[PDB]
Amino acid sequence: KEEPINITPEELDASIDRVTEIMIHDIFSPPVASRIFAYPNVAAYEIVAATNDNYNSLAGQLNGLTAIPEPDTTKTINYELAAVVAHMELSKRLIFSEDRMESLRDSLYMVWEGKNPVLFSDSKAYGLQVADHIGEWMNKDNYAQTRTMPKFTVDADDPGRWQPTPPAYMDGIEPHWNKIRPFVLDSAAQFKPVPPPAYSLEEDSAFYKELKEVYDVRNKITEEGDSSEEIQIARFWDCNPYVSKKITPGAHWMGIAKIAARKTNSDFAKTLFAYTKASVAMADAFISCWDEKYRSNLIRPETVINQHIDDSWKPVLQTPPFPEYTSGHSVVSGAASVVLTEVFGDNFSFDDDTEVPYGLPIRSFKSFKQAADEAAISRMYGGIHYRAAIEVGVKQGRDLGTFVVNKLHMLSDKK
Numbered sequence: 391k392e393e394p395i396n397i398t399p400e401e402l403d404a405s406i407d408r409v410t411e412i413m414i415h416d417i418f419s420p421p422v423a424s425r426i427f428a429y430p431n432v433a434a435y436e437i438v439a440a441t442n443d444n445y446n447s448l449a450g451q452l453n454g455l456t457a458i459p460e461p462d463t464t465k466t467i468n469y470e471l472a473a474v475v476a477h478m479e480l481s482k483r484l485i486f487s488e489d490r491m492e493s494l495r496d497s498l499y500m501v502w503e504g505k506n507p508v509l510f511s512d513s514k515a516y517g518l519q520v521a522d523h524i525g526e527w528m529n530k531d532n533y534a535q536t537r538t539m540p541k542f543t544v545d546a547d548d549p550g551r552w553q554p555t556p557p558a559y560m561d562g563i564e565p566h567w568n569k570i571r572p573f574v575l576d577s578a579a580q581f582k583p584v585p586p587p588a589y590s591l592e593e594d595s596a597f598y599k600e601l602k603e604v605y606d607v608r609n610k611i612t613e614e615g616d617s618s619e620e621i622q623i624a625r626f627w628d629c630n631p632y633v634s635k636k637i638t639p640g641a642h643w644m645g646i647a648k649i650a651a652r653k654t655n656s657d658f659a660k661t662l663f664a665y666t667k668a669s670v671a672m673a674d675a676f677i678s679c680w681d682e683k684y685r686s687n688l689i690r691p692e693t694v695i696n697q698h699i700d701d702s703w704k705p706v707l708q709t710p711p712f713p714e715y716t717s718g719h720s721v722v723s724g725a726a727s728v729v730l731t732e733v734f735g736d737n738f739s740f741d742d743d744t745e746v747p748y749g750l751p752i753r754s755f756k757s758f759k760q761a762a763d764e765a766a767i768s769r770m771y772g773g774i775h776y777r778a779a780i781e782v783g784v785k786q787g788r789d790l791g792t793f794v795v796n797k798l799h800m801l802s803d804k805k
């Protein structure tokens with residue numbers, strides 16, 4: 391039995407789809423999701439870069455990353471197969487419900503092994519060797535240590551400080567996300583933005599005026615009635631697993647990267663190049679954004695409105711359980727759109743069907759940037775951000791993503 395084994399980008403997509411699903415079932419948060427996407431892409435990309443003269447190794451470019459082992463030249467290895475192996479193995483390690491990765495994996499293994507047991511076996515061994523190397527590095531990123539650090543300390547005596555919001559009143563998510571090793575940033579605070587307008591109920595103050603806009607936008611939306619377009623836009627981008635089945639913003643952008651790669655018929659290495667660069671950038675965008683959320687510790691609009699303006703007002707969207715400034719939707723979309731523009735081009739139009747399996751319709755866009763701008767403004771229609779977190783958050787993600795694409799040297803022709 392010595393048939394060739396044809397590995398397509400769609401088999402990388404099947405691993406990413408599957409981990410996406412399990413992340414939903416397992417209830418991982420938006421910043422933790424971004425870690426789970428990045429490391430398995432890196433391992434798979436390393437295997438391509440070791441064996442393809444057009445792609446440079448990320449070793450020496452990502453913080454702490456050294457060269458992976460080279461393949462044994464006396465073995466016959468399908469490197470894309472090895473790469474899918476390594477992606478699935480690290481995705482398995484990163485989620486909680488491991489048996490749902492293992493069923494995906496075993497069903498592919500069964501066909502590979504049936505077609506060509508020696509090619510399967512040699513390629514799998516190298517993929518796993520490579521996953522062990524990446525996993526040693528990934529296990530030094532301080533994630534394990536932060537798993538036992540203290541919860542965010544809520545204090546009502548501190549007037550502009552973030553409080554848990556109804557219905558669930560969940561404690562703030564990942565208050566020490568800024569202690570995770572970044573991939574590319576010099577430090578987590580590298581893109582620290584300007585501070586938010588000072589919390590104040592003075593009617594002439596910047597903060598009050600922004601408070602009144604959130605309040606007024608929502609009431610204008612009520613007077614327009616359900617359906618409308620602004621409510622659909624807030625819902626499409628919401629991506630909040632704590633509503634009381636949804637994917638996170640990181641996941642949504644991975645789905646957009648997949649749509650672009652398939653629309654262009656990108657081959658396996660091009661597709662993986664795009665996913666790696668996007669997932670790495672989004673992972674540092676989350677670190678950067680969570681760094682600012684937990685520096686400014688800012689109260690979300692509904693709490694201020696209900697306590698001091700109007701006790702019956704409710705945001706169009708349920709408020710996410712973490713501080714306000716800057717907006718994760720803004721920063722993460724901003725970084726992801728800069729990467730994908732750099733990879734696939736300006737005015738890349740696409741139909742975004744990523745939300746079709748989670749309750750929602752298709753929305754079309756003329757460019758990644760238009761989608762990211764929509765993502766950002768959706769948070770104002772949604773009632774859960776003031777304008778600064780939105781606008782400053784876009785600049786933050788754009789600046790961070792520009793830094794990542796100007797730093798990482800991955801595509802690099804032999805020819």
Ligand code: VO4
Pocket residue numbers: 710713714716717718719720769774775
């Ligand atoms: O994920 V947000 O920081 O846009 O509520």
Ligand code: NA
Pocket residue numbers: 438439440441442443444445446447
């Ligand atoms: Na190379």
